[PDB]
Amino acid sequence: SLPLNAIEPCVICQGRPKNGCIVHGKTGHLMACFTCAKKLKKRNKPCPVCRQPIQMIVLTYFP
Amino acid sequence: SLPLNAIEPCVICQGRPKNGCIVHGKTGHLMACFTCAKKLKKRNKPCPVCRQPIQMIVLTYFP
Ligand SMILES: [Zn+2]
Ligand SMILES: [Zn+2]
Ligand SMILES: [Zn+2]
Ligand SMILES: [Zn+2]
């Protein structure tokens, strides 16, 4: 939960770091990778929590 | 990467539970609040790592 050093992996594959912040309209998701995000995007999946259809994925870094 | 252990709070204001992922030039910064981002946005600050002038902020929730 820390604002630093918490460079944790994905929530589905969990093999790779959480580098792939996802956005659906005006809100987004944390703790999933670019791979898992790209997969759910190609499938056009409505978010498993927010239920919103995703729009984009970005290369995500830390301070 | 699944339980409550993924808050990723503020890093400048006070360390409060708020979230606010930032996106500049198709790349982005995670592990700060909406106020952290808004503060550096209005001051038009070039990123302390990427050196890019920031463009967007969104409510980025976790599992
Ligand atoms: Zn993954
Ligand atoms: Zn969502
Ligand atoms: Zn803050
Ligand atoms: Zn940056």
From Swiss-Prot, chains A, B:
It is found in: Nucleus, Nucleoplasm; Cytoplasm; Nucleus, Nucleolus; Nucleus. Ubiquitous. Isoform Mdm2-A, isoform Mdm2-B, isoform Mdm2-C, isoform Mdm2-D, isoform Mdm2-E, isoform Mdm2-F and isoform Mdm2-G are observed in a range of cancers but absent in normal tissues. Changing residue 1 to A: In MDM2-6A mutant; abolished phosphorylation by ATM and ubiquitination by the SCF(FBXO31) complex. Changing residue 13 to G: Fails to interact with MDM4. Changing residue 33 to S: Loss of ubiquitin ligase E3 activity. E3 ubiquitin-protein ligase that mediates ubiquitination of p53/TP53, leading to its degradation by the proteasome. Inhibits p53/TP53- and p73/TP73-mediated cell cycle arrest and apoptosis by binding its transcriptional activation domain. Also acts as a ubiquitin ligase E3 toward itself and ARRB1. Permits the nuclear export of p53/TP53. Promotes proteasome-dependent ubiquitin-independent degradation of retinoblastoma RB1 protein. Inhibits DAXX-mediated apoptosis by inducing its ubiquitination and degradation. Component of the TRIM28/KAP1-MDM2-p53/TP53 complex involved in stabilizing p53/TP53. Region I is sufficient for binding p53 and inhibiting its G1 arrest and apoptosis functions. It also binds p73 and E2F1. Region II contains most of a central acidic region required for interaction with ribosomal protein L5 and a putative C4-type zinc finger. The RING finger domain which coordinates two molecules of zinc interacts specifically with RNA whether or not zinc is present and mediates the heterooligomerization with MDM4. It is also essential for its ubiquitin ligase E3 activity toward p53 and itself. It is linked to Seems to be amplified in certain tumors (including soft tissue sarcomas, osteosarcomas and gliomas). A higher frequency of splice variants lacking p53 binding domain sequences was found in late-stage and high-grade ovarian and bladder carcinomas. Four of the splice variants show loss of p53 binding. This is E3 ubiquitin-protein ligase Mdm2. The chain holds residues 429 to 491 of 491 of the full protein.
